[PDB]
Amino acid sequence: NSALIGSENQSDSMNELNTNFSMTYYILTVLPGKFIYWIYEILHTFFVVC
Amino acid sequence: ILDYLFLLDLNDDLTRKAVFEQVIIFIFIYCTMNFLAWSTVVELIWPTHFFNRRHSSSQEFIRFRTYTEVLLKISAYNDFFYVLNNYYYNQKLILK
Amino acid sequence: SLHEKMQTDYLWVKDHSQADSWAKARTHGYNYIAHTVPNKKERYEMIWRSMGKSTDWELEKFRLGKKFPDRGNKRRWFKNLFRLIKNPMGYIFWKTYKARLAKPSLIVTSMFIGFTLGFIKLKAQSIAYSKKQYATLRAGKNIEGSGQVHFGYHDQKWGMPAIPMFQLMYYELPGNSIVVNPCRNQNYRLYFEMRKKLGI
Amino acid sequence: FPDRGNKRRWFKNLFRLIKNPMGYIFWKTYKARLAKPSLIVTSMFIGFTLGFIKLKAQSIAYSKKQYA
Amino acid sequence: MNPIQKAWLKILEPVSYVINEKMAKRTGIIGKLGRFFAIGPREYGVHPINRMFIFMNRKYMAFQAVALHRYSFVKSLTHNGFHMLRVFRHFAFVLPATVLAGLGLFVYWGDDNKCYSPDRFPYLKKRAGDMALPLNSLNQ
Amino acid sequence: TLQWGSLAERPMVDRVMSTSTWPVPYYQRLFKAYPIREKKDKMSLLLSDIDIDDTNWYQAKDFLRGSFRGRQIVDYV
Amino acid sequence: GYKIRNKSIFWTRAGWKNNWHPKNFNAPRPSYGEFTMGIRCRNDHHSFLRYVQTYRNMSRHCKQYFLGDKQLEETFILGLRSLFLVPYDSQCLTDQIKHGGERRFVDQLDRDFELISYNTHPYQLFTYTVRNEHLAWKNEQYEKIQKGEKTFEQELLDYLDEQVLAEKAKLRDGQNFSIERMTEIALHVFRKARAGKVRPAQDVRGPDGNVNDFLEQRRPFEHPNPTGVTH
Amino acid sequence: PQLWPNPNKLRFADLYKYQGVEMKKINDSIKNYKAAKFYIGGILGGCLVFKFFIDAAVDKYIFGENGNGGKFLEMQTINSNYDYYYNRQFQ
Amino acid sequence: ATALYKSSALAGNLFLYAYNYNNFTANIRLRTMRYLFPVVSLAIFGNIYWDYRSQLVKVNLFDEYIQARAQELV
Amino acid sequence: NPNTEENTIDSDYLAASGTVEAEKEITSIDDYLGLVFAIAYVFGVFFYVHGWTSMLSHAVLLLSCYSIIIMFLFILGMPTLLLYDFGIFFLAYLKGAGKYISSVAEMMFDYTACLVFYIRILAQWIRVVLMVVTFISLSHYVSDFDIT
Amino acid sequence: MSRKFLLTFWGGFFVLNFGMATVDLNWIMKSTYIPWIFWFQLMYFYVEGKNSMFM
Amino acid sequence: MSRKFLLTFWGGFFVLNFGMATVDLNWIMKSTYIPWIFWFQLMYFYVEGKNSMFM
Amino acid sequence: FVMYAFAAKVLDHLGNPFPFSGHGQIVAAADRWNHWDVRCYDNVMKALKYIRIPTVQNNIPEATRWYGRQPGHLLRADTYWIPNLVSQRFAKHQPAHWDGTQNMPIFRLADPKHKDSYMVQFR
Numbered sequence A: 001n002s003a004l005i006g007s008e009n010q011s012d013s014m015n016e017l018n019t020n021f022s023m024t025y026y027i028l029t030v031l032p033g034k035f036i037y038w039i040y041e042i043l044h045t046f047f048v049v050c
Numbered sequence B: 001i002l003d004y005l006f007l008l009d010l011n012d013d014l015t016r017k018a019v020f021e022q023v024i025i026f027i028f029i030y031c032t033m034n035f036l037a038w039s040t041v042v043e044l045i046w047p048t049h050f051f052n053r054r055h056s057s058s059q060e061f062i063r064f065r066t067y068t069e070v071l072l073k074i075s076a077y078n079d080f081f082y083v084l085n086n087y088y089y090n091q092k093l094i095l096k
Numbered sequence C: 001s002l003h004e005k006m007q008t009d010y011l012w013v014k015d016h017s018q019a020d021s022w023a024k025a026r027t028h029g030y031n032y033i034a035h036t037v038p039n040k041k042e043r044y045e046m047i048w049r050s051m052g053k054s055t056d057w058e059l060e061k062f063r064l065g066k067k068f069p070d071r072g073n074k075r076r077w078f079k080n081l082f083r084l085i086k087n088p089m090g091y092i093f094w095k096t097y098k099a100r101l102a103k104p105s106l107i108v109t110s111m112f113i114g115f116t117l118g119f120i121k122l123k124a125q126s127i128a129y130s131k132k133q134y135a136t137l138r139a140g141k142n143i144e145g146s147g148q149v150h151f152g153y154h155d156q157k158w159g160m161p162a163i164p165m166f167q168l169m170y171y172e173l174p175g176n177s178i179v180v181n182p183c184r185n186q187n188y189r190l191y192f193e194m195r196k197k198l199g200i
Numbered sequence D: 001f002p003d004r005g006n007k008r009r010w011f012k013n014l015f016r017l018i019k020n021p022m023g024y025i026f027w028k029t030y031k032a033r034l035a036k037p038s039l040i041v042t043s044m045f046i047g048f049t050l051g052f053i054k055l056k057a058q059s060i061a062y063s064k065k066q067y068a
Numbered sequence E: 001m002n003p004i005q006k007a008w009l010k011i012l013e014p015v016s017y018v019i020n021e022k023m024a025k026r027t028g029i030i031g032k033l034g035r036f037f038a039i040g041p042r043e044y045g046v047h048p049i050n051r052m053f054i055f056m057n058r059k060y061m062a063f064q065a066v067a068l069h070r071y072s073f074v075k076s077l078t079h080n081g082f083h084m085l086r087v088f089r090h091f092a093f094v095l096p097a098t099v100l101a102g103l104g105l106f107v108y109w110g111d112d113n114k115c116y117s118p119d120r121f122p123y124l125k126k127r128a129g130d131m132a133l134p135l136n137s138l139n140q
Numbered sequence F: 001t002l003q004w005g006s007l008a009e010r011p012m013v014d015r016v017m018s019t020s021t022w023p024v025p026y027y028q029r030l031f032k033a034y035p036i037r038e039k040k041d042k043m044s045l046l047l048s049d050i051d052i053d054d055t056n057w058y059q060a061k062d063f064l065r066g067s068f069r070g071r072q073i074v075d076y077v
Numbered sequence G: 001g002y003k004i005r006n007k008s009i010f011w012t013r014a015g016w017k018n019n020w021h022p023k024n025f026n027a028p029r030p031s032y033g034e035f036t037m038g039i040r041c042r043n044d045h046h047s048f049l050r051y052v053q054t055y056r057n058m059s060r061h062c063k064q065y066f067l068g069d070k071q072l073e074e075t076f077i078l079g080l081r082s083l084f085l086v087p088y089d090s091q092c093l094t095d096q097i098k099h100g101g102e103r104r105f106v107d108q109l110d111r112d113f114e115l116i117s118y119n120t121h122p123y124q125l126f127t128y129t130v131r132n133e134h135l136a137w138k139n140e141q142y143e144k145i146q147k148g149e150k151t152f153e154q155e156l157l158d159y160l161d162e163q164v165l166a167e168k169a170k171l172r173d174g175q176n177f178s179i180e181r182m183t184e185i186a187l188h189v190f191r192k193a194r195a196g197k198v199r200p201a202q203d204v205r206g207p208d209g210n211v212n213d214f215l216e217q218r219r220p221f222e223h224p225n226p227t228g229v230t231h
Numbered sequence H: 001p002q003l004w005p006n007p008n009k010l011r012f013a014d015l016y017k018y019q020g021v022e023m024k025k026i027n028d029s030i031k032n033y034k035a036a037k038f039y040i041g042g043i044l045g046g047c048l049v050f051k052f053f054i055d056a057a058v059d060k061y062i063f064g065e066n067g068n069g070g071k072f073l074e075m076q077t078i079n080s081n082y083d084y085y086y087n088r089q090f091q
Numbered sequence I: 001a002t003a004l005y006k007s008s009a010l011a012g013n014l015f016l017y018a019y020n021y022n023n024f025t026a027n028i029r030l031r032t033m034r035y036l037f038p039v040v041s042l043a044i045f046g047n048i049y050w051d052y053r054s055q056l057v058k059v060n061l062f063d064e065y066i067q068a069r070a071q072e073l074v
Numbered sequence J: 001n002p003n004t005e006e007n008t009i010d011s012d013y014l015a016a017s018g019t020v021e022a023e024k025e026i027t028s029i030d031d032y033l034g035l036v037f038a039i040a041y042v043f044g045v046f047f048y049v050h051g052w053t054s055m056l057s058h059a060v061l062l063l064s065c066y067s068i069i070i071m072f073l074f075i076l077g078m079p080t081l082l083l084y085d086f087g088i089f090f091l092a093y094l095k096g097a098g099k100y101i102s103s104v105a106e107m108m109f110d111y112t113a114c115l116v117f118y119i120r121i122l123a124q125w126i127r128v129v130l131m132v133v134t135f136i137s138l139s140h141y142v143s144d145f146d147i148t
Numbered sequence K, L: 001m002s003r004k005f006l007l008t009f010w011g012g013f014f015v016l017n018f019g020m021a022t023v024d025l026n027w028i029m030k031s032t033y034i035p036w037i038f039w040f041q042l043m044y045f046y047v048e049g050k051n052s053m054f055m
Numbered sequence M: 001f002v003m004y005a006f007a008a009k010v011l012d013h014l015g016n017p018f019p020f021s022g023h024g025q026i027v028a029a030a031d032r033w034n035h036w037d038v039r040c041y042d043n044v045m046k047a048l049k050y051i052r053i054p055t056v057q058n059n060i061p062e063a064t065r066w067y068g069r070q071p072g073h074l075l076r077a078d079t080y081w082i083p084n085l086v087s088q089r090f091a092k093h094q095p096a097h098w099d100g101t102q103n104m105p106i107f108r109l110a111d112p113k114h115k116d117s118y119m120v121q122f123r
């Protein structure tokens, strides 16, 4: 819901205390790393299937 | 100290009328509406002025000089204009 | 002029890439092609001409040579996003200038604004109702489905039709008008009486 | 005066679409269809459209489940 | 360029020497990295918010001058100065009063700034975690 | 014509180049950039078709008085 | 070039090019004493003297800020007259204006003097700016003459006098050195001189159709990242 | 002419003392900030004087004449007598 | 937070007047603002300080009562 | 460019068409031009001009509800100030010369002249009622039209 | 034109974003029916009908 | 181009028709999120990325 | 890049970058002064503290429903309904003499069925 505009899913973690134990600066450290692995999964797939 | 300063109260305005909190909303909207209307009227005189001062002249009538055109001609001429005038004078009025 | 270079660099961005410095990689125009313009075929002919001049009209060289993408278009979506964030009103103004040359009537502009805001108004109410359902959930009532469009045997309330007829009869509940009773202020009488008893 | 030649033009195009929808659609989209996208794009259009229709059909069925 | 940018320069003066002289030209990656984080005059360093204020300040001020520059309602009552028949003289001080009321546009913005919010229902919801409550919560 | 193409390619049909260079940048300039409000040494273009008036002889004296022969002409006239 | 093609461009319900008495329903009608009980009117016969006193005030109140500059007082007088001669020379029949043009112009000039009394009229500020820009250039010439140096204006006057001798020294078949020839000689010198200066771009388009602005940098891309300050 | 500053070929000291058109605007704004010292100062001075009259009025509004309560305890309504007894029965 | 915002908003008006001092002061078309801007500012300050002052008095009356009434019950 | 941008074209010529009507000689256009802006949000509801004010309050027709009152009060004062401009002779400006020597008799004829003076104005607000009643009748038929 | 496929993705991403976020969207569509019919039938002539009818 | 206002009405009429008819439109949006991401991230290169990346 | 890093520092607290979407998240210290000015209100305690378990008879507790019907107080002042915008200009504000209670309905009541609140939409 942190990526939704005007969310109405109030029961899906919107009104709850949600912390984590990952690296901070999430969008600068963690979220790119998830996209980096994404680019590997798809490049490894293209190279294999082709 | 007088009781007239009691009008400055808004913590307990709900005890007397509770009307100020709603009327000023309209006043802010009314000012905003006039700002858009009047600003358009007073600003949009420039297209007419810009056009008439550049296209309304005709050869069958005399175009008379304005205040600005007087000061610009006498106190805002450039160097080439000064040269051309004296260039014409020295050649024809002096050197023939 | 004197402050022209310093100022012009301050107002706008230049393209830092040197994609076109490399000659062979220069595009002939076959990477991003216009498909619908009335001069479509004249564009393909110029692409063909550039491909022929590069090979002295021996296109077998092009077939054996390496084909490159248009490196100049790299990271273009990101660059437009950063300009939109830097100055969104300037990016919107100039990207819509040619479209805003044709200005619809006051009626059409008012309909765009009214329906757009009226849609946002209902979205704000739908969010508030979601908070009502969350409070209802926490209060001990489980909720199957969602929304207020009751499929069963219940009364619905659709929302104020955004037309003057209903906007004159109805108006939404302003929460700031629900107040504490002023009788609360009568408890201050206790304070004034205590202050006098204690000699204050 | 108005352009009385454009009178009832919306009704007339509607009846032509009913008479022969494939011909009305074909010729009204001819110049646009000259530029045909790739097989991938054409497939994505069809796949996403038919998938949206397939979910619409399931939601119609779930409504009959709620009515029962 | 503005004073705040010049203040950064005196503080970053030694840092600029390391990036622009040493890193920006050493070789390879250390060069690309130093030339990318170079220090100097800001490219596209204009601040649109500052400009947005300058434009809207000027446009709204031109409106204030028109709305405030009106012929007096009091002077028109005697029929001796510039005004004999003015059937809408009682509208002379509406726009001036409307502009002076605009000074409270931001001072009184929203419900909380027009009253004592703790005596209003929306305050209870904010203290309850922006949560919906029954309308009679201020009484119970 | 009224059928110029798709909406996405609409800004493409505007450019008209005076040279044979390919590819051609699509953007068609609307206005001239005016970043610095500089005072133009250029004289005003309002001084265009104004008939003879008093400003002509007043300026003639100012320029004639800048010469010895002109000072004689003005004083005698 | 282009002329208005509509022949009825200057037609009004009141007549051709009528901007003095537009046609309106509530038209002026006469009054008869024997039948008129009372009347409320603001018209009077005081505009002539108010037109005179208004000129004296606008002149005397603007001269307060000329600092005794005689040439400016005389230039301003010529400009002030141009503002008062508008009703005497206009195509508009100011004598046939709806409700009295005399009272109208006087009241309009009074609004100008009100601003002049406060030294806030745009013509005043325009005058101060134009004059300061003029005196700065005359002082630059004076400082160059006191130093024995030659002014940029004299270098052209001297360069033009010799160019005329060269042309008439070869123009022996004819001997009519027209003003047209004298003119195009100077213009050929002005264009060459102006182009030499580093002036801001005035024309939209340069030799090519392309615009001469800092924004008209299209592909190909050949500029690298911007470099920082040097120590 | 050619000594005009270039954002690329620029020295550190020169950029620190550039003083371009941007600063010229700011220096004009500063000229107004300084000239408004007495007008703004006069307003704040009145707020400081008006502050002491407000303190006494608040006490007059809360405590009243003899420390028993002022107009702070007064509450008025536009309801009729029927409207009031309707609300009670509604309760 | 309410008293601080309205104080910062009032300060914003003083900046708007300062930023436009030459126009409000020398242009007669803005005389009404030059004359009445301080009257409106004082009334705004009065509302801000009146509310804060009244709030402060009620808080002290409450604190001193709960302490006195608590001892009587002990 | 005021000759290519239809947005400034529409607003410029519209305003010029409104101010040129000062030749109709109603009164100072500098005075009543502000009331026109308010009257526009009364009758402009028919054209949805109030759309941009939907988020500015909890009532979409707030500015229109105030403007109709403004429109009524200042139009109600236009005749009152006009009599103040006539002076003590204001009754002669309306009815003219009397007919009978009795001041009490004329007093009754002069009162009718002053009432008629206002009825010519207040009676025209029944036209506004017809416009609203007819506007409601249509909203009722469209809002209750069949949909299944 | 150079990023139609990409802009089409982000165009639909926000549509799904709003749709996935708006759970009572049917209540919004139904609440919008009346004003959609009322305003278009009232303003049709002054926008489009005038070009083929009375004035 | 002669009926943009009228066609705009019928377009939004059938959008509202489908929206008023489709009560669980939110369930369809959420059920479409995964295939929207999957097919666009998989086919991006072969449609759009090839023009600026690799081949 | 710098502003992208600065926004990352903020978004660790603010969470959602879009407006009118959600709320930020700040963990604060627990002290005796938490919610000190709302301890008198009961519904605020129930909403913050208690997560009630839904039963088979899926309903809100009857006691909670009953307390919720005791109507709250709603101000008479109303400029949003044009009849009151006109009528309340001629209304006389008379003193409401305290009768010794804390529930004097000197205003209207926040109930949809109240004769002075039926124009208000309760959704």
Ligand SMILES: CCCCCCCCCCCCCCCCCC(=O)OC[C@H](COP(=O)([O-])OCC(O)COP(=O)([O-])OC[C@@H](COC(=O)CCCCCCCCCCCCCCCCC)OC(=O)CCCCCCCCCCCCCCCCC)OC(=O)CCCCCCCCCCCCCCCCC
Binding pocket: C089, C092, C099, C100, C102, C103, C104, C105, C108, C109, C111, C112, C113, C115, C116, C119, K032, L001, L002, L004, L005, L008, L011, L012, L013, L015, L016
């Ligand atoms: C969306 C399509 C379907 C989706 C698939 C999309 C496929 C990919 C394409 C995607 C991109 C599509 C582009 C659409 C936009 C238009 C494109 C365009 O520019 O073309 C040129 C176009 C020029 O118009 P023109 O046709 O060449 O001729 C104009 C002439 O003046 C006069 O011309 P005329 O006399 O011949 O006709 C008069 C009038 C014709 O009259 C009308 O257009 C009727 C307008 C009535 C109001 C309709 C309001 C729209 C609905 C809003 C409601 C919210 C959505 C949900 C609720 C509704 C439920 C259905 O002309 C027009 O308005 C032109 C626009 C008509 C076609 C587009 C209309 C779309 C209407 C909505 C479609 C249904 C929405 C579905 C969305 C579903 C979402 C889940 O550009 C414009 O300038 C018009 C755009 C409209 C804007 C009007 C001015 C608005 C001013 C507001 C300023 C507010 C400032 C806020 C600033 C914020 C801070 C920064």
Ligand SMILES: CCCCCCCCCCCCCCCCCC(=O)OC[C@H](COP(=O)([O-])OCC(O)COP(=O)([O-])OC[C@@H](COC(=O)CCCCCCCCCCCCCCCCC)OC(=O)CCCCCCCCCCCCCCCCC)OC(=O)CCCCCCCCCCCCCCCCC
Binding pocket: B033, B034, B036, B037, B040, B041, C104, C105, C106, C107, C109, C110, C164, J007, J010, J011, J014, J015, J017, J018, J019, J021, J022, J024, J026, J036, J037, J039, J040, J041, J042, J043, J044, J045, J046, J047, J049, J052, J064, J065, J068, J131, J132, J135, K046
């Ligand atoms: C002595 C003479 C009197 C002096 C007059 C002085 C006038 C001074 C003019 C000053 C102009 C101001 C300059 C700035 C304007 C810029 C703002 C603007 O709107 O330009 C639009 C601008 C120009 O529009 P246009 O496309 O050229 O069309 C103009 C005309 O329609 C022309 O195009 P058309 O020929 O195709 O139009 C045909 C017309 C055909 O109309 C008709 O044939 C009959 C109409 C009858 C209407 C029936 C009303 C029924 C009401 C029922 C009410 C029921 C509910 C009430 C509930 C109340 C509570 C109980 O149908 C219309 O479309 C009318 C347009 C809508 C007008 C709405 C207001 C109507 C009331 C007018 C009040 C003034 C009356 C003066 C008395 C005149 C007596 C002869 O276009 C734009 O879209 C750009 C700006 C868009 C901004 C939208 C934001 C609007 C709101 C803010 C605007 C700014 C502040 C407010 C200004 C007032 C606006 C209403």
Ligand SMILES: CCCCCCCCCCCCCCCCCC(=O)OC[C@H](COP(=O)([O-])OCC(O)COP(=O)([O-])OC[C@@H](COC(=O)CCCCCCCCCCCCCCCCC)OC(=O)CCCCCCCCCCCCCCCCC)OC(=O)CCCCCCCCCCCCCCCCC
Binding pocket: D006, D007, D008, D009, D010, D011, D012, K041, K042, K044, K045, K049, K052, K053, L006
């Ligand atoms: C004492 C007791 C009294 C009892 C009786 C009371 C009855 C009173 C009668 C008096 C009323 C009539 C007054 C005479 C009118 C004379 C005016 C005139 O000269 O003609 C103008 C009008 C001008 O049309 P035009 O110039 O030829 O061309 C039109 C344009 O080209 C435009 O065409 P287009 O192709 O460009 O497309 C646009 C068109 C069409 O655009 C559309 O898309 C609308 C389509 C509407 C129909 C479909 C609705 C959707 C639902 C059904 C789906 C059907 C399609 C499905 C397809 C298959 C699906 C798979 O837009 C229109 O709506 C055209 C309507 C005509 C203009 C009138 C102004 C309309 C503005 C308001 C619009 C909203 C109302 C719509 C009403 C329906 C209009 C057809 O001609 C007429 O229609 C005259 C109608 C008068 C007929 C009177 C017949 C006798 C009446 C008495 C019989 C007994 C009645 C008993 C009733 C009992 C109680 C219920």
Ligand SMILES: CCCCCCCCCCCCCCCCCC(=O)OC[C@H](COP(=O)([O-])OCC(O)COP(=O)([O-])OC[C@@H](COC(=O)CCCCCCCCCCCCCCCCC)OC(=O)CCCCCCCCCCCCCCCCC)OC(=O)CCCCCCCCCCCCCCCCC
Binding pocket: A049, A050, D036, D037, D038, D039, D040, D042, D043, L046
């Ligand atoms: C002896 C040597 C070999 C000779 C073989 C003989 C060849 C005979 C050719 C016969 C031609 C038949 C002509 C009639 C059909 C023409 C109509 C047509 O649809 O063609 C497309 C036609 C032409 O499109 P185009 O834009 O010109 O692009 C052409 C090419 O795609 C080129 O586009 P590009 O230049 O952009 O290249 C990029 C390429 C890039 O591709 C790559 O770089 C590598 C591809 C790697 C694939 C990795 C696959 C991984 C699979 C994982 C799946 C795992 C799940 C398995 C489940 C197991 C469960 C346990 O990606 C694609 O193009 C995607 C194309 C899709 C191809 C699907 C078939 C793939 C394998 C076919 C194998 C056939 C044997 C060939 C052996 C050669 C070996 C050296 O599209 C149309 O515009 C016509 C309308 C199409 C409407 C859509 C619906 C059509 C479906 C019905 C079609 C008719 C019935 C079925 C026909 C077969 C369709 C597959």
Ligand SMILES: CCCCCCCCCCCCCCCCCC(=O)OC[C@H](COP(=O)([O-])OCC(O)COP(=O)([O-])OC[C@@H](COC(=O)CCCCCCCCCCCCCCCCC)OC(=O)CCCCCCCCCCCCCCCCC)OC(=O)CCCCCCCCCCCCCCCCC
Binding pocket: J076, J080, J083, J084, J086, J087, J088, J089, J090, J114, J115, J118
């Ligand atoms: C809930 C209430 C609702 C009602 C709302 C109504 C609101 C109305 C607001 C209108 C504004 C009112 C303010 C008036 C401003 C007056 C200022 C002023 O004093 O300037 C003087 C000014 C006169 O100056 P002038 O006309 O320019 O020139 C004078 C000539 O030069 C003079 O030439 P002359 O020297 O030849 O004339 C001789 C002499 C001739 O005078 C005579 O006729 C003589 C009379 C007899 C005197 C007694 C003689 C006794 C003889 C004793 C003999 C003793 C013999 C002893 C012998 C000695 C034995 C030894 O004339 C005079 O000098 C007297 C003229 C001035 C009289 C002013 C009367 C004002 C009465 C107002 C009283 C009520 C005010 C209440 C205000 C409340 C505000 C909160 O007064 C006026 O102009 C009056 C105009 C007022 C018209 C207002 C009409 C508005 C409509 C009202 C009724 C509407 C009913 C329909 C309602 C529909 C719903 C809306």
Ligand SMILES: COC1=C(OC)C(=O)C(C/C=C(\C)CC/C=C(\C)CC/C=C(\C)CC/C=C(\C)CC/C=C(\C)CC/C=C(/C)CC/C=C(\C)CCC=C(C)C)=C(C)C1=O
Binding pocket: E004, E049, E053, E056, E057, E058, E060, E061, E064, E102, E103, E105, I013, I016, I017, I020
């Ligand atoms: C007086 O007459 C009038 C005018 O004059 C003609 C007007 O222009 C106008 C029009 C008004 C405008 C165009 C202005 C409109 C402004 C609006 C809507 C709000 C603007 C909001 C912003 C620009 C965003 C600001 C965001 C914040 C303040 C939040 C973060 C905090 C920030 C940035 C500041 C930190 C807070 C502090 C308390 C520290 C303060 C720091 C300083 C003072 C340092 C200053 C440093 C230097 C070097 C000067 C009106 C209404 C008027 O009445």
